[PDB]
Design a protein around this ligand. Structure first.
Ligand SMILES: [Cl-]
Ligand SMILES: [Cl-]
Ligand SMILES: [Mg+2]
Lengths: 233, 233
């Protein structure tokens, strides 16, 4: 088979811890809005469930990949969307290194040491891709990332076809010469799989590396990415 | 004369020091690129001026401004546009409160305690409007700003008439009940005045508060904003 030249990474729940970030955000939004933390925490889950359900079917207008979530949240809580934007800014300044998931920097180093190209393909919600890029840069991860592709900056989102192809084209590689790893089945796995790339789904509820189908695997943690990479090299 | 209900604010060189930022940015960009700061500073200057001119020509695309400035800089230096994006994240991480211009907090506080609404109206270049919002938030200034209207988010730019009108329609006030202060004569001053608002041009080389004309003022720094405010009240 063709040799893998590019490994692409999802961010939330693959490299960084999403719940800590979402909790810091709910907290910060509740603080500046003077609202009860439970109402804010619930609104966040509702907006996230809704958009996740839409994105799986490519039903959200990519032009609102960011603004949509922000305005939906603002409306649920009856506040100016300006407060939502400010809350994300404060949350990004309040989180820290505890956000980095175990084995993350090691897996990135493994890829870069084999001479492979790396990239980040992440969707966005509530806060722009620029905020997430700030975190990657701040935790030293960007040292191992060659290119970053955030939904709001590319005007698309996983599992949409043009989102992955944009990345493949940027590195001038073919789908079969690429592998994408992410934790959202409907977004990362199916997205990369139907474009032709090798796909790896992180299922923390899993125990071992499993071949799910042709060009598709399931692994318990990013720590096992090196096993999949080595298996197909 | 109608009483002023809204005071709008330019950001760079009005509230925050743009020299310090551009310098931190040029240093970070030169650092990750392996180029001399001089090379980078010149490219920044060249892009900065060429963009200013296009705005004077009212022939700039509000939706491409940010990416344009980054692609223009990346091309002048012959680097991947990714290094430009990383540099803005790194600069934002390496700057501090020394970025706040003297008297900014007091000036903002004076306007707020006066019971007036406030807003930020700024153009974007090199780093997204969101990074600018992050710093204002980080330095405690967003506490005195009710709304933000950035070119990359609102899809318009000063001195264009629609940019100022968006803010007027947002706060639902007449041009005569608004005062805009900024340090760029063509973008801030002439743009605000042609729309009918009170306009204050910050001129550092200035020595005292000066009435430039009907609804037009010139002051050396934001520390004298209150003088104009109380003057027309
Ligand atoms: Cl805080
Ligand atoms: Cl590096
Ligand atoms: Mg993500």
């Amino acid at each position: 088979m063709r040799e893998v030249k590019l490994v692409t990474f999802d961010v939330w729940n693959t490299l960084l811890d999403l719940n800590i970030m979402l909790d810091e955000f709910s907290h910060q939004l509740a603080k500046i809005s003077g609202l009860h933390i439970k109402d804010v925490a619930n609104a966040v889950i509702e907006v996230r469930n809704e958009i996740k359900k839409m994105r799986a079917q490519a039903s959200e207008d990519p032009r609102k990949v960011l603004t949509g979530s922000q305005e939906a949240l603002a409306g649920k809580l009856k506040v100016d969307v300006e407060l939502v934007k400010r809350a994300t800014a404060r949350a990004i300044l309040n989180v820290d290194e505890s956000l980095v998931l175990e084995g993350t920097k090691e897996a990135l180093q493994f890829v870069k040491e084999r001479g492979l190209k790396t990239a980040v393909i992440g969707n966005v919600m509530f806060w722009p891709g620029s905020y997430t890029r700030l975190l990657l840069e701040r935790f030293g991860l960007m040292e191992f990332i060659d290119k970053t592709f955030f939904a709001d900056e590319v005007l698309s989102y996983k599992p949409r076809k043009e989102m992955f192809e944009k990345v493949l084209n940027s590195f001038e590689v073919k789908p079969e010469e690429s592998l994408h790893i992410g934790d959202t089945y409907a977004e990362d796995y199916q997205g990369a799989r139907k474009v032709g790339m090798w796909a790896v789904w992180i299922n923390q509820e899993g125990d071992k590396v499993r071949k799910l189908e042709e060009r598709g695997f399931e692994i318990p943690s990013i720590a096992n990415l090196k096993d999949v990479i080595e298996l197909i090299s």
